[PDB]
Design a binder for this molecule. Structure first.
Ligand SMILES: Cc1cc2c(cc1C)N(C[C@H](O)[C@H](O)[C@H](O)COP(=O)(O)OP(=O)(O)OC[C@H]1O[C@@H](n3cnc4c(N)ncnc43)[C@H](O)[C@@H]1O)c1[nH]c(=O)[nH]c(=O)c1N2
Ligand SMILES: O=c1ccn([C@@H]2O[C@H](COP(=O)(O)OP(=O)(O)O)[C@@H](O)[C@H]2O)c(=O)[nH]1
Ligand SMILES: O=c1ccn([C@@H]2O[C@H](COP(=O)(O)OP(=O)(O)O)[C@@H](O)[C@H]2O)c(=O)[nH]1
Lengths: 510, 86
């Protein structure tokens, strides 16, 4: 029997990856296509929730810094107005020994206690000498750390923090993933700073960035989705894929609709895809991948932004006096992420956990904090007490004063948080992805292709754009297979308007 | 007597031996000195030959920093010959 619908290229999922695919498919305007999503609102893990009190929370707080001009082009098309964006400078610190060490930590030893400083430089010297002679390569993420920073920093920050976020020991992870993620410290630069007491916080793709004025990052992906022809979309319960028949190239949707395809671009989690295919081999294969779940906690507090907080952006917490690994002053990103000062809200509780002095609706202004906590079979979290442990954690780290007035809470558990860069990961992926490609299925995205190196909105979006370009023009998928390549260059060649469109336009005016 | 010996540099009294007391120098000078020691230490880890001149020895063991700030000028001032000739 024939499918209810037939198209050349079918995109599953409307997060950044999928929309990337849809944008390029829309630009080329050649083969027929369709994008579906089980959610009425596109954006996936890049979406935004709002509390009953009017606070916005990303999925951990998201940040736009682009390696691609194509990515930029599409954002400027969705949000063309100027007052649609704010530009920020990256103010990032690490919490250590009661200090706010400027990021990257390994580059600002100066702020630590003198006692600790000595232990870090000692380690760094032992490594710089051993690295002067090394000929082999690091096997684990742990070996990589010890070699690039020394034991001083490893025990002080790297080891404890990484477990805290990955929910697995540094010894169980690979190291080919950390190109532009972890800074390798230069002895000359580290000591120079310790001597001058200066700071080095320019490092990284994060230095400067922009944030959407309204709707958080979620509003971006809504704006983008609006540029696509509606007739080619299915968002909501009518767009969930419940079965994938790779053998006869059909997909079955939640309401029973079937779609035939020639090429399939899938952005759903590859472990879910295996299930929906009912393929025993792929299931056993995907079950060798590892992932951590992420608890996002949102806290809205009353008052004008404290001076202790200032223009800070996101913070790191390697110490065990709080459950979360990262915190974001989400209210500094936009004046529309929290209620306006005039809005009246009762105090739900004080930061220390006790009842407020007054429960009457008072005015603002307000600010917001967003926290992330990791969870895995190696690092369990109690779902009934986590919110309380975070708030307390906030006090322990001098983020909030015990007497601070909390006006709103938020808590959500995302089962698939991070795709874990385990030692076994590439062993499994190098099987799965080619096996899926041989069925004409491009599985791409954070959990589509499972590579954290290149998980991230701009990267994921591009993974999509490239999967289409590979399917239609034979383009090599650079972002997928060569993360270091795309990350250390300016990717300017592909644009939202290429020659193919320019020529086709003049040929019509001709 | 105990040896109380300093080197006069940049209007400071740097305790002898100079190359062990970079602490007392101005911060800007300290930077040049440590950078040299690091580049020198990193080459020392790998050397298998022996220095020819006195100058090659000073660069290998203290770096360009200390070499240019103290050693080179001083050693001429006392030996009345360039380090390169010793
Ligand atoms: C905690 C944390 C923090 C960060 C970020 C994420 C996370 C979780 N990100 C990365 C980012 O969120 C990510 O790259 C994109 O969301 C990935 O897009 P995907 O489409 O691949 O996945 P994602 O999961 O987001 O989207 C896929 C979609 O597919 C749909 N779907 C699933 N199954 C389906 C089915 N069966 N049928 C139909 N639809 C289905 C989902 O409903 C959804 O709409 C990020 N990015 C950034 O650049 N800055 C940052 O700060 C960070 N940091
Ligand atoms: O001060 C720091 C903080 C971060 N990291 C490393 O950077 C990685 C990713 O940090 P980032 O916040 O950029 O990752 P994200 O979760 O936002 O994708 C972490 O796993 C750490 O190993 C680091 O080297 N120094
Ligand atoms: O702070 C110092 C002082 C001395 N010198 C070196 O030590 C050598 C001998 O100095 P010393 O005063 O011991 O010589 P003396 O004149 O007493 O025999 C000199 O040539 C310098 O090269 C040095 O390395 N650092």
């Amino acid at each position: 029997t024939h499918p209810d619908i037939s198209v050349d290229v079918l995109v599953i999922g409307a997060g950044p990856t999928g929309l990337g695919a849809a944008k390029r498919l829309n630009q080329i305007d050649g083969p027929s296509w369709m994008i579906v999503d089980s959610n009425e609102t596109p954006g996936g893990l890049a979406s935004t929730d709002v509390t009953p009190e009017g606070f916005l929370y990303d999925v951990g707080g998201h940040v736009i810094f682009s390696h691609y001009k194509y990515f930029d082009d599409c954002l400027d098309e969705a949000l063309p107005k100027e007052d649609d964006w704010y530009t920020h400078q990256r103010i990032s610190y690490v919490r250590c020994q009661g200090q706010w060490v400027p990021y990257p930590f390994q580059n600002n030893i100066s702020m630590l206690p003198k006692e600790e400083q000595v232990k870090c430089i000692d380690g760094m010297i032992d490594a710089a000498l051993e690295a002067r002679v090394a000929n082999t390569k690091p096997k684990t993420f742990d070996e990589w750390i010890v070699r690039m920073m020394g034991t001083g920093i490893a025990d002080l920050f790297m080891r404890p923090y990484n477990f805290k976020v990955w929910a697995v020991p540094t010894t169980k992870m690979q190291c080919a993933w950390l190109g532009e993620k972890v800074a390798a410290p230069n002895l000359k630069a580290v000591t120079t700073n310790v001597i001058l007491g200066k700071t080095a916080g320019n490092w990284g793709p994060n230095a400067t960035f922009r944030f959407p004025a309204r709707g958080g990052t979620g509003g971006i992906w809504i704006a983008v989705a609006n540029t696509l022809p509606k007739e080619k979309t299915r968002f909501g319960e009518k767009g969930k894929v419940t079965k994938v028949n790779a053998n006869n190239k059909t997909v079955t949707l939640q309401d029973g609709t079937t779609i035939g395809y020639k090429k399939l671009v899938s952005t759903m989690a590859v472990d879910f895809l295996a299930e929906a295919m009912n393929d025993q081999e792929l299931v056993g294969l995907t079950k060798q991948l590892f992932y951590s779940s992420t608890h996002v906690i949102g806290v809205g507090v009353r008052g004008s932004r404290p001076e202790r907080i200032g223009d800070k952006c996101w913070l790191y917490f390697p110490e065990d006096n709080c459950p979360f690994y990262r915190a974001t002053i989400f209210s500094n990103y936009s004046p529309y992420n929290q209620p306006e000062a005039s809005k009246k809200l009762p105090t739900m509780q004080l930061a220390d956990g006790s009842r407020p002095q007054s429960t009457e609706a008072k005015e603002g202004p307000y600010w917001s904090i967003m926290l992330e906590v990791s969870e895995s079979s190696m690092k369990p979290v109690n779902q009934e007490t986590i919110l309380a442990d975070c708030i307390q954690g906030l006090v322990n780290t001098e983020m909030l004063k015990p007497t601070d007035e909390i006006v709103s809470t938020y808590h959500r558990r995302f089962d698939h948080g991070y795709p874990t860069p385990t030692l076994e990961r590439e062993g499994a992926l190098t099987q799965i992805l080619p096996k899926l490609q041989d069925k004409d299925i491009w599985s791409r995205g954070r959990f589509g292709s499972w590579r954290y190196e290149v998980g991230n909105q701009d990267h994921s979006f591009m993974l999509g754009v490239e999967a289409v370009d590979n399917i239609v023009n034979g383009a090599v998928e650079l972002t997928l297979n060569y993360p270091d390549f795309v990350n250390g260059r300016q990717n300017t060649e592909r644009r939202l308007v290429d020659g193919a469109q320019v020529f086709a336009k003049s040929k019509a005016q001709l």
